[PDB]
A paper describes a structure:
The polysaccharides in red algae (Rhodophyta) are primarily mixed galactan agars such as agarose and carrageenan. Detailed analysis of the enzyme activities encoded by the CarPUL, combined with interpretation of growth phenotypes, have allowed us to propose a refined and detailed model of κ- and ι-carrageenan processing by some Pseudoalteromonas species.
This was enabled by the use of a mutant that was inactivated by a serine substitution of residue C77, which would otherwise be matured to the catalytic formylglycine (FGly) residue. Each of the six S1_19B [name] monomers in the asymmetric unit contained a single intact κ-NC2 molecule with continuous density occupying the active site pocket and spanning the catalytic machinery. H233 was positioned ~3.1 Å from the scissile bond and oriented to protonate the ester oxygen in its role as the catalytic acid. Notably, this mode of recognition necessitates binding the non-reducing end of the oligosaccharide, not internal chain binding, indicating a specific exo-mode of substrate recognition. Overall, the data support assignment of S1_19B as an exo-G4S κ-carrageenan sulfatase that is specific for the non-reducing end of κ-carrageenan oligosaccharides.
Numbering used by the authors:
A (entry chain B), B (entry chain A): 27 to 473
The structure:
Amino acid sequence: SKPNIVLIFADDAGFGDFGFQGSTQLKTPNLDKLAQSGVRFTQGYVSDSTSGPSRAGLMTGKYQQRFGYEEINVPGFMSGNSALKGADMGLPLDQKTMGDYLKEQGYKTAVFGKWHLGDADRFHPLKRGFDTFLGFRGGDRSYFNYSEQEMKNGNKHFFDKKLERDFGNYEEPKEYLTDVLGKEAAKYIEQNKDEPFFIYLAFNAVHTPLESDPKDLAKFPNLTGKRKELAAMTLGLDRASGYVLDKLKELGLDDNTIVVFSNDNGGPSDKNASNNAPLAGTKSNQLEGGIRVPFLISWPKHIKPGSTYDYPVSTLDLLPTFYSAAKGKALGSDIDGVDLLPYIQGENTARPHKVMYWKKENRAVIRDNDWKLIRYPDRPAELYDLSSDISEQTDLAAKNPERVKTMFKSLFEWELTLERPRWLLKRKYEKYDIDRMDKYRLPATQP
Amino acid sequence: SKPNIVLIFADDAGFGDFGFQGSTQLKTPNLDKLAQSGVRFTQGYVSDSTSGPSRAGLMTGKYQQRFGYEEINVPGFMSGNSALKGADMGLPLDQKTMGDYLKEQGYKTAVFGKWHLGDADRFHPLKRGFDTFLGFRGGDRSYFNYSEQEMKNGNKHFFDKKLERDFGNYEEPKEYLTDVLGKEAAKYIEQNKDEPFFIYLAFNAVHTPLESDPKDLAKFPNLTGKRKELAAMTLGLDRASGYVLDKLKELGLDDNTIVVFSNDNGGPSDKNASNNAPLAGTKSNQLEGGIRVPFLISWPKHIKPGSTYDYPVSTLDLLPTFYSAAKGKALGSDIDGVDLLPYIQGENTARPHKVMYWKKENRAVIRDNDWKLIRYPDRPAELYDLSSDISEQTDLAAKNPERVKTMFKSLFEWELTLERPRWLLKRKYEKYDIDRMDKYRLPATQP
Ligand SMILES: O=S(=O)(O)O[C@@H]1[C@H](O[C@H]2O[C@@H]3CO[C@@H]([C@H]3O)[C@H]2O)[C@@H](O)[C@H](O)O[C@@H]1CO
Ligand SMILES: O=S(=O)(O)O[C@@H]1[C@H](O[C@H]2O[C@@H]3CO[C@@H]([C@H]3O)[C@H]2O)[C@@H](O)[C@H](O)O[C@@H]1CO
Ligand SMILES: [Ca+2]
Ligand SMILES: [Ca+2]
Ligand SMILES: [Cl-]
Ligand SMILES: [Cl-]
Ligand SMILES: [Zn+2]
Ligand SMILES: [Zn+2]
């Protein structure tokens, strides 16, 4: 029978900020049990170090730069010269989503929480292969209800923060947003328990603003300031994930449900006190700390519990993995991801991806097996062996000049397959991205 | 007394394709006499290796990337994702031109020939500080008249090729276009001989298409194919320049006229058989062959004949040089060029520009004294000492790693002062630009 699919996708979480990732300071008991129920990927990657492009890759199974979704869509952050601004920045309409492909296979489809794939009506999830929505079009919002005064005083971009049911039915959350999203996902499972369903549960946790349930804050008496708020927000994320995992268990659906847990980008250590241990870097740089994310898959009928998979995988792999599981036999020729199940099961012992790519303007990465070439606008290209240097502290470029040259040529060959970007950030954000990378250049460690 | 100013600006000429630049094969007797009458710059630079951005720099005295004019405006070559296309690509209206500054000093101002600073009415020379125009809005056109059928049946961009008098009075050339432009400039001098005037004579010679006066072709029986056409087109450019220089001499105006001769970008050796000897590279790359140009200034009242100046200078310097000569005392604080006259006269013995910059997307150059750092998307950054290696054959990056790092940081610091581009080329043109660079990577020789 066609399995249910639940994709749980956090925002701005630290690589080290889960029990199953080695945290003793933060508590994620429900997600730790999910990790134990299935396979944990030690080298799971997003397709970009920021939210919008990462989600564009996830939703399409494609390198998002191929359709010009290169720089992040943040209304108010965009160049005065940007081709598209405000509500016009969105996943191009000619792209086929995860939702569209699973609808073709007879699935009920729903998205809860953060969309961030366009604010205009034409970009709405209910036009992009989702039957049901409760969430917000934009990129960040309060974990509590906005007052009438806050909504009346919002700038022209503020409307994308409003919580929305299906197509334009605006309704603020009645309790802590993380709990609302988890309970709504659980209600959807209950309502659709007799048919195949796909849920995209896109928490805004643990993105700013740093707002928590006071009862969650009170569980971390020894933490202070931003770190205390992150701990409480992480406990909330884990509890709300628990509502969904517990509903699957209670209804006897979890055996034939694919549950994925991942994260849209590396932790912004300066904004939400996220910790990417043992990685260097953060959100919005292409060090491991920005692009490597917590990544779990559970499917009890096909995946051994307590297992780990150690070759690189991508969120780009999730569309073809889901589509294959849904018995799909008409996958677009343009898909960059691969079906992971044969790799997870050990039927295919090769690497899912020999070569992987990242790009924002002049900043780009080509990875070939465990060699990682990083290109920058402001310093010579660096070469890392990730098999011996997870924290990217030992530059090998000078000692491997032929490999640097061949990897440079391969990177540019891939860049020639991309469209020009559809929108551009203000110039100042490139200084911020590089300065934050240099601030977090040393390996992070568990506290 | 305020001097007359005549700026003669060729298109796509080879660095070596003039008598005064060391050609024995090509004939430029009028421009050779101009060189002998004044100062020849051995290190004269444009602000970009392509027409539009080069002209935007020339016309403003500013790094054109500071107002987003980074990639060339060619209607039909632009990305489907480009912010501006067709007639909307043009010199931003908030920029003050050479024309505007000289109009403030009580000059009559005229442009003849190629404009290429925007096709829409609002970008027209008569809105940008020019009283008089005979030329074409766009980037290239036939040296002979278009028929009514050719003009009626052109694609939607073709109208920018039509020869135009002042504001929208269309009239095709009655003779070889190079002769028309030179004679019209000479008539303007005659009509305005009793008052200060500024003429911008922007020849389309020696840009494609390769069309010549048959009488000029017949002077080069020993040359064949594209090189024979270039020789004839170059003879025409030199003759038409002669009409202007001879009119100044005949009316007794040349003593107190500043005559400048330069070129919009390096020779496209693969298109018009231009030869950039002794330089490596071409049009649309940032090797010396793309950015270094023939550069002459004559002003008999102030500049010694037969002189050479060997420190780097820029077309960016021409606006402040002209404005100072016109007795201007209110130069904008935003000007990147300097007044060259004190440097030419030896009053200021320093370099006009210690640090110079070039940029198109990932391709950029920072020059510091005679050190040149070249950044590429597809190979490690290279370092040249131009004082010992004019042809950029000996990469010194490996032996000077501290200087590579410091120059990289300085380059990026300048990039942070720029706007994002206002329009973007189709991706395929970056492959063309890099492949042509590699084809002409060796030094050119006379041939
Ligand atoms: O998680 S998001 O990427 O969506 O967060 C963004 C924003 O973060 C960005 O800010 C600029 C643009 O790209 C880089 C940085 O240079 C990225 O970190 C975040 O600061 C803001 O609070 O929310 C938006 C989403 O709305
Ligand atoms: O001299 S021009 O640059 O104005 O000539 C251009 C064009 O040359 C360009 O073509 C693409 C875009 O940038 C590079 C190259 O990658 C530059 O060489 C030339 O081929 C064409 O014939 O005329 C246009 C101007 O209309
Ligand atoms: Ca995020
Ligand atoms: Ca040109
Ligand atoms: Cl951030
Ligand atoms: Cl060309
Ligand atoms: Zn005279
Ligand atoms: Zn004289």
